[PDB]
Each structure stands twice: as structure tokens, then as C-alpha cells.
């Protein structure tokens, strides 16, 4: 009868302390943020329209390179993968350690964000990639230069890898809400972009297909979810800028859960908002590594 008061009081005090720990941690991080992290990436001599051209010009090592897709836009930095599947892959998206926040507004996702590359343990060039999103405008311009194939790669917290390859990939411009289109799939990860989550059925599965979807950010709703409640937005609940439908089969720009396994009660909104790819691990497993790479498609 009384043990009730006993217990409760015990928890409300334990929690009071948990709040103490957290308040400390947040306060400490705020101090470390008075100064920024840094890098020094000396620029490679060789350059080109994109990584494919650069590798055909002799750039055989994976590192940061400067590219100029077109004489209109000023040259910009990007990370080239020159080893995977014969190289020439231009990374446009990369997740690997939760170092960068992906819950950003529309402008940042348009302009691009994150760290393209970091210094290789004691070296003058940045041979390692950081976590980043290239930028919708840039990604759009790259895919509309000519046929483009997309390579999505991932790995779990145990070290297993799978991949989703798309022979055709295009992203329209801002005026077209960065509309996406993909085709000619193949791989071991599961065709989540075209066929939606294979664990769902009929209507349910269909609303998780990304192919053809527009892009959304928590401050710009363009998802395939008609509602009135300003809080029922895919981008808001699954925290990330993506081509959400209603809502997703794949959430590559989701929240980076350490360890991998997570549950509905850990999620800020109770939704599977992690670095997910349902067709392979379901909606409650966040990948340790996830990335997107494009390359000119030579039939």
C-alpha cells in the first residue's frame, strides 16, 4: 500500500540527478564550441568536370578533389572514390560517425553542408571523407549533364555490407522541388527507392516508394502526406532532408543512432527516424556507414 510512495520518490530523485548529469554535459559542450575543429586540405593539381574525368586524367587515389562541372559555377571541393568499382565516383552524401547534424532547413540542404574531407593521420592532403551533403543545386546540375548512375553503399555495426545500384539517376532543379527519378536497379540491399519497403503490403508499401518524390526539409513540406496538423510532416518526424513520400523505406539522412539497434521510445517523435534502409534491416536499425555516389553512365 505505502511502497507506492517509496518507489515513486526513488525515481523522481534518480531522474533529478540524470537531469544534473545532462545539464553538465550540455554545458561542457557549449564551452568546447567556443572554438572550431579544423582541417588543412591542400588541393590536388589535377581537376575536371567530375571524378570520372579526373580518374581518366590520372588521379588514381581517393581524396578530396576540386571539380568544375561547368564554367558557370565556380569550382568546388568534393570527395572522389577512385577504388570502388573502378573508381570515378563522386560522393554526394556520406554518413560514418554521426559527426554532422542532418536535421537542417531548406537553404542549407540547397547550398550543401558538412565536411568534405579530413586530414589523413599526419599528412598534408585530406584523404579521408567527412560526413556531408553535397548540395541539391550541385547534385541536380551533376545529374543533368548526361546519363548518371547512382551507387548507394552501407554497412551495419557488425561489419556486413550491402549495396543498391541505380543505372539511371536524375534530380531536377529547385523550381521543380528537386524531384528525383531512378531506374535500372541491382544489388543486395533491396530496391527501397523504387519498390518501397518489402515488409509492407499494397497501399502501405506503395506510400514508401521514393522514386518520383519531391524533396522536403522540416521547414518546407513537399511530402506525399496530406494533413492539416503542422506536426504531421515526414521531415519533422523522421528528422532529415529527403525525398519523403509517406514516409520512407530509406532514411539515409536520418539520425545517427550509436550502436545500431534503436526503438520507438528513443525516437524524438516515436518514428523510425534513423539511418534506415528497411529492405535490409527493418526500420529500427541505424547503419554505421551509409553513402551516395554518382558517376557518368557509360552504356
Amino acid at each position: 500500500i505505502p511502497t507506492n510512495l517509496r518507489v515513486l520518490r526513488s525515481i523522481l530523485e534518480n531522474l533529478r540527478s540524470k537531469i544534473q548529469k545532462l545539464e553538465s554535459d550540455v554545458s561542457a559542450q557549449m564551452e568546447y564550441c567556443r572554438t572550431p575543429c579544423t582541417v588543412s586540405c591542400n588541393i590536388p593539381v589535377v581537376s575536371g568536370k567530375e571524378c570520372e574525368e579526373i580518374i581518366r586524367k590520372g588521379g588514381e587515389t581517393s581524396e578530396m578533389y576540386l571539380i568544375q562541372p561547368d564554367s558557370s559555377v565556380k569550382p568546388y571541393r568534393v570527395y572522389c572514390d577512385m577504388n570502388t568499382e573502378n573508381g570515378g565516383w563522386t560522393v554526394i552524401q556520406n554518413r560514418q560517425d554521426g559527426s554532422v547534424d542532418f536535421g537542417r532547413k531548406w537553404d542549407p540542404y540547397k547550398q550543401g553542408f558538412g565536411n568534405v574531407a579530413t586530414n589523413t593521420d599526419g599528412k598534408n592532403y585530406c584523404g579521408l571523407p567527412g560526413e556531408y551533403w553535397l548540395g541539391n543545386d550541385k547534385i541536380s546540375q551533376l545529374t543533368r549533364m548526361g546519363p548518371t548512375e547512382l551507387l548507394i553503399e552501407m554497412e551495419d555495426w557488425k561489419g556486413d555490407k550491402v549495396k543498391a545500384h541505380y543505372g539511371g539517376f536524375t534530380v531536377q532543379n529547385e523550381a521543380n522541388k528537386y524531384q528525383i527519378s531512378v531506374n535500372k536497379y541491382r544489388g543486395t540491399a533491396g530496391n527501397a527507392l523504387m519498390d518501397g519497403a518489402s515488409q509492407l503490403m499494397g497501399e502501405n508499401r506503395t506510400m514508401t516508394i521514393h522514386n518520383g518524390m519531391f524533396f522536403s526539409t522540416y521547414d518546407r513540406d513537399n511530402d506525399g502526406w496530406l494533413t492539416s496538423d503542422p506536426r504531421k510532416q515526414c521531415s519533422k518526424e523522421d528528422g532529415g532532408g529527403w525525398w519523403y513520400n509517406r514516409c520512407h523505406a530509406a532514411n539515409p539522412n536520418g539520425r545517427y543512432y550509436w550502436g545500431g539497434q534503436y526503438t520507438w521510445d528513443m525516437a524524438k517523435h516515436g518514428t523510425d527516424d534513423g539511418v534506415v534502409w528497411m529492405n535490409w534491416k527493418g526500420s529500427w536499425y541505424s547503419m554505421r556507414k551509409m553513402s551516395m555516389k554518382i558517376r557518368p553512365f557509360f552504356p
Binding site: 519497403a197 509492407l200 506510400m207 514508401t208 502526406w225 515526414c234 509517406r246 520512407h248
Partner: peptide, 4 residues
């Protein structure tokens, strides 16, 4: 995931 989806939103019934």
C-alpha cells in the same frame, strides 16, 4: 516507415 509508413503513416497509415
Amino acid at each position: 516507415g509508413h503513416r497509415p
